Amino acid sequence: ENAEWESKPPPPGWRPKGLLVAHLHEHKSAVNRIRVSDEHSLFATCSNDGTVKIWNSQKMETRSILTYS
Amino acid sequence: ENQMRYAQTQLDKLKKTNVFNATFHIWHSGQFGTINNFRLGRLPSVPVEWNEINAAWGQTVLLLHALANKMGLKFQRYRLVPYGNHSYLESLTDKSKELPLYCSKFDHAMVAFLDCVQQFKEEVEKGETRFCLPYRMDVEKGKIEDTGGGSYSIKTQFNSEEQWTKALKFMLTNLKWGLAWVSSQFYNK
Amino acid sequence: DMKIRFWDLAYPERSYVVAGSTSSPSVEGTEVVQEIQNKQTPRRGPESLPVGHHDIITDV
Amino acid sequence: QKLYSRAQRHQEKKEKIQRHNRKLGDLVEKKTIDLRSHYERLANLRRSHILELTSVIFPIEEVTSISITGPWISLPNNGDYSAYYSWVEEKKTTQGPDMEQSNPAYTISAALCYATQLVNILSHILDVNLPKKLCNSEFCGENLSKQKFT
């Protein structure tokens, strides 16, 4: 009865304008998935370079706050 | 393939755009002439700030200077002193007095600038017999005249901005063709 | 196609390309939203850098 | 009898897909070598184009201070622009005359102007998306206020 689709849905009438905020390239090759923590505090992107990189959502006014390989 | 086609696109856009054409772009809108989207002169119907005109000179001075510097042309009468907000000229034969191109004097600087344009034009015309300029210049009078027979003054004193801004556009239109010639001699080498 | 599309499932005529400005070419009983590209020089300011991606986008 | 043909045809499919897989990996290998050549052609063209850009229009030379377009325009190496800030805050409260062309408020503005233009040209040549959207007009116009300048 009460399963919310999103922990934080888009703002009302949200319309992404297309303004680039951060251009990131810390991955040596193709990124395979982007997942956002349900808190939306962090997100992570994994890549064919065998590394995964974790990013601070609030720092997208940029750096891979954490990395694993 | 997408990465390769992108790199190919970058190569093509670089080859199509010599260093000068990338550093300076020249166009117009009505009576306004523009270098790097800075308008030179002002319409009588528009309160254009002198600050913008000073910036437009800072570009035009660097443009004409750099074009000569690349071509190896050394000026005979004046030394261009490019400043983004306070461009002026230093005469090679008279360094005791000066007059600036920025406004907020003035008149000897505008003609001295045309003197540099004349010296540049003579060097470009010494190039190929096929080169000409659409607007005539009389540095002795301080005037610019069209051919495709109107006459206008680059001296703004004892005149009005409408006749003056057109003459600035005309002069910039000459520099457009000058830049095109310089690029045509180095874009493929 | 490296073009982010915002699709409005309630008012599909309002759907638009997010990954690009207007410099790009604008656009069986099943409710199908069809995108048809419109059948569309003065240096009105400099050309900006392409802000979008230049390779296959893999996730959003 | 339907399974014997299936075992045959599935085995032929396994052989065909395996052969196709081999040719794709080899094709990507070859296409990567070409992409490497493209990126090096672009790197060489960019660097040659940039070297021309500085040697012809934006010469950068050091004399401690560093200059752009020529020695008449320069900025201090330590980036301790507190001198200009002091003249700005002093002039904004007690205005004074611009008696000489070498005034700090003149040369410094010209330096930041050509610097902002150079970085924008470099940005286009290098195809680098800048993190802070900036344009040459930011250093043109009136003498910048403490807020907008900083």
UniProtKB/Swiss-Prot annotation, chain B:
Q: Provide the protein's localization.
A: Mitochondrion; Nucleus; Cytoplasm
Renumbered residue ranges of the record's region Required for membrane-association: 164-189
* Chain segments carrying region Evolutionary conserved domain (ECD): 1-189
Q: Where is this cross-link: Glycyl lysine isopeptide (Lys-Gly) (interchain with G-Cter in ubiquitin)?
A: K143, K176
Official protein name in the record:
Beclin-1-C 35 kDa
What gene is this protein a product of? BECN1
What stretch of the whole protein does this chain cover?
251 to 450 of 450
UniProtKB/Swiss-Prot annotation, chain C:
PTM summary from the entry reads: Myristoylated.
Tissue-by-tissue expression:
Ubiquitously expressed.
Which portions of the sequence form the region Disordered?
Answer: 39-51
Residues with PTM Phosphothreonine:
T41
* Subcellular compartments: Late endosome; Cytoplasmic vesicle, Autophagosome; Membrane
Instruction: Name the residue ranges with Basic and acidic residues bias.
Output: 41-51
Q: What functional role does this protein have?
A: Regulatory subunit of the PI3K complex that mediates formation of phosphatidylinositol 3-phosphate; different complex forms are believed to play a role in multiple membrane trafficking pathways: PI3KC3-C1 is involved in initiation of autophagosomes and PI3KC3-C2 in maturation of autophagosomes and endocytosis. Involved in regulation of degradative endocytic trafficking and cytokinesis, probably in the context of PI3KC3-C2.
Q: How does it assemble?
A: Component of the PI3K (PI3KC3/PI3K-III/class III phosphatidylinositol 3-kinase) complex the core of which is composed of the catalytic subunit PIK3C3, the regulatory subunit PIK3R4 and BECN1 associating with additional regulatory/auxiliary subunits to form alternative complex forms. Alternative complex forms containing a fourth regulatory subunit in a mutually exclusive manner are PI3K complex I (PI3KC3-C1) containing ATG14, and PI3K complex II (PI3KC3-C2) containing UVRAG.
The UniProt similarity line reads: Belongs to the protein kinase superfamily. Ser/Thr protein kinase family.
Would you tell me the protein name for this molecule?
Phosphoinositide 3-kinase regulatory subunit 4
Q: Which organism is it from?
A: Homo sapiens (Human)
Curated annotation (Swiss-Prot), chain D:
Which GO terms are recorded in the biological process aspect for this UniProt protein? autophagosome assembly; autophagosome maturation; autophagosome membrane docking; cellular response to glucose starvation; cellular response to starvation; defense response to virus; early endosome to late endosome transport; endosome to lysosome transport
Instruction: List the Gene Ontology MF annotations in alphabetical order.
Output: GTPase binding; phosphatidylinositol 3-kinase inhibitor activity; phosphatidylinositol 3-kinase regulator activity; protein-membrane adaptor activity
Say where the protein is mainly found: cytoplasm
For this UniProt record, the keywords arranged alphabetically read as follows: Autophagy, Coiled coil, Cytoplasm, Cytoplasmic vesicle, Endoplasmic reticulum, Membrane, Phosphoprotein, Ubl conjugation
Please report the PTM annotation for this entry: Ubiquitinated via 'Lys-6', 'Lys-11' and 'Lys-63'-linked polyubiquitin chains on multiple lysines by MARCHF7, leading to ATG14 aggregation and loss of interaction with STX17.
What does the UniProt entry say about where the protein is found? Answer: Cytoplasm; Endoplasmic reticulum membrane; Preautophagosomal structure membrane; Cytoplasmic vesicle, Autophagosome membrane
Q: What GO CC terms are in its UniProt record?
A: autophagosome; autophagosome membrane; axoneme; cytosol; endoplasmic reticulum membrane; extrinsic component of omegasome membrane; extrinsic component of phagophore assembly site membrane; mitochondria-associated endoplasmic reticulum membrane contact site
Q: Family per UniProt?
A: Belongs to the ATG14 family.
Q: What is the UniProt domain comment for this protein? A: The coiled-coil domain is required for BECN1- and PIK3C3-binding and for autophagy.
The protein's name is: Beclin 1-associated autophagy-related key regulator
Question: What would be the name of the gene that encodes this protein?
Answer: ATG14
First and last residues shown, out of full length: 149 to 345 of 492
